[PDB]
Amino acid sequence: ANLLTSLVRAHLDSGPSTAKLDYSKFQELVLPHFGKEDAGDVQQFYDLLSGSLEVIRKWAEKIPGFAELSPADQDLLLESAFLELFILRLAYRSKPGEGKLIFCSGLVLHRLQCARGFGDWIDSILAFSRSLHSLLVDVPAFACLSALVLITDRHGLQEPRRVEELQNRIASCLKEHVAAVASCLSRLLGKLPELRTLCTQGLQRIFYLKLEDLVPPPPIIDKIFMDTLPF
Amino acid sequence: PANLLTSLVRAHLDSGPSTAKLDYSKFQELVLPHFGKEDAGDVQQFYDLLSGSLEVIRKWAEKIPGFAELSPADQDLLLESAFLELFILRLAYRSKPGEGKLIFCSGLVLHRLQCARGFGDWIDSILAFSRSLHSLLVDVPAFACLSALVLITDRHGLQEPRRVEELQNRIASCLKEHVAAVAGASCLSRLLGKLPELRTLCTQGLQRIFYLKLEDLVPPPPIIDKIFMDTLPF
Ligand SMILES: CCCCCCCC(=O)c1c(O)cc(O)cc1CC(=O)OCC
């Protein structure tokens, strides 16, 4: 009902439409990947993880009843879920037939201009990408899935039962939508385990980039990292 | 007889395995590990192959002249700062890359595939490094000196750093005295040409332990955890 529509509203307002792209730096050619990753790839990596914070935030608040959660609760769910959301929305938004990563701002890059920036991670992104595109998830269901991933418990919640009351309401609307158009639905959900795997890949890379320390993370990345660390 | 080298190599051999007293009671040159994942046994066994890597490097570091006579806060710092860089090196030389056998300080022998689940892709790099090592065929005395200079070096925090700098020089004199009694400089330069391939195994090592601290099947022993914690510049 209104939930299905209020989620597709917030969703399409967080990504670029078919019309609103910008190829203003796209070259399907990359000159010799000299040595390995230089500071140019590291700071680009940080500026493209920076270019999804504001987007995933407004996308979160324009979802029914997200703002009605405590100031501290909204912060932790968003911090702990950022990486996965960033990934999810990027993979589904991309093109793995030609190798095109399309970002939530509207800019498009070829996988080779990312390779030095992101590391092995990106392939597991493409591998999950087509695996999503083979499922051909429809926009309303994807607007719901994006929410479902964010609307999930992070250790420390003040009102975990209230977060739980919203998820089963969102998950029921996907089950009801997929039934309005159950093994398909389980094949839908079964991607989040591969997602919670790809996140760890993301952290595996950032550990070695703060280590390497060509360029240091933006401060708020520094935060999310430290705060999502179990140690 | 160059008695620093005579009194030094003693510590080395007495900290390494002697052919006859290796351990074959666990070796399987073949094993089918479900690649991609690894259970607590592989991890706690990996952890108990590194907890003991510190006590052996411990019972190899006491026998370093002027090291037991360093402020206990200093001795702990160099052992922790070099532990991982030391572990990879000693493993590579006594290992057998052309057989498929990692021979540890405690005389234990395993097959690459038995480490596959426990260790992961990292260990392949180790083997790849042993190969690069053995092709140079570095002799026993010169190696005994190198592992020390990886330990006896300027780290961040030293209380009495000028002392550590005098011991560094004291180790180099006995190596330079030995490099002249062999050719009676060159090999030293060829060797350093793969020290980046050593600092690489360090970084990969940290990342491996990072991933299993993420995984937290078994919690790391606090001693290694501490080495980890303070080896981070953040
Ligand atoms: C699973 C244990 C490691 C096996 C080797 C895979 C290559 C690697 O070193 C690595 C990583 O471990 C995590 C990452 O996010 C990215 C990379 C690749 C890398 O550094 O870019 C090129 C040098």
Length of chain A in residues, anyone? 231
State the CB neighbour count (10 A cutoff) for residue A47. 12
What is d(CA A107, CA A21) in angstroms, rounded to the nearest whole number?
Answer: 6
Q: Answer yes or no: do B210 and A210 touch at CB < 8 A.
A: no
Expressed in angstroms, the distance from the first to the final Cα of chain A is 42
- Alpha-helical segments (H) within chain A: 2-12, 39-50, 53-61, 71-93, 111-118, 121-133, 139-150, 160-180, 183-189, 192-212, 219-228
The Cα of B89 is separated from the nearest Cα of chain A by a number of Å equal to 21
A213: closest chain B residue by CA: B233
Residue among A33, A120, A200 to mutate when testing ligand 1 (max atoms within 8 A of CB): A120
Chain breaks in chain B (C to N over 2.5 A) after: 184
Any B CB within 8 A of A54 CB: no
What is d(CA A137, CA A150) in angstroms, rounded to the nearest whole number?
Answer: 18
CB pairs under 8 A between A and B: 23
Please tell me if the CB atom of residue A204 comes closer than 6 angstroms to any atom of ligand 1. Answer: yes
The CATH number assigned to the domain holding B181 equals 1.10.565.10
Which pair of structure tokens corresponds to residue A194? 């591969």
In whole angstroms, how far apart are CA B134 and each of A143, A196, B49, B109, B125? 57, 41, 23, 18, 14
User: What Rg value do the Cα atoms of chain B yield, rounded?
Assistant: 18
Of A208, A230, A231, the CB nearest to B203: A208
State the CB neighbour count (10 A cutoff) for residue B19. 7
B219: closest chain A residue by CA: A231
Phi and psi angles of residue A200, each rounded to the nearest 5 degrees, phi first: -55, -40
The Cα of A208 is separated from the nearest Cα of chain B by a number of Å equal to 7
3-class SS letters over B122-190:
HHHHHHHHHHHHHCCCCCHHHHHHHHHHHHCCCCCCCCCHHHHHHHHHHHHHHHHHHHHHHCCCHHHHH
Asked whether the beta carbons of A167 and A102 are under 8 A apart, the reply is no
Any B CB within 8 A of A213 CB: yes
Its domain, for residue B69, covers 1-234
What is d(CA B57, CA B12) in angstroms, rounded to the nearest whole number?
Answer: 9
Say how many domains are in chain A: 1
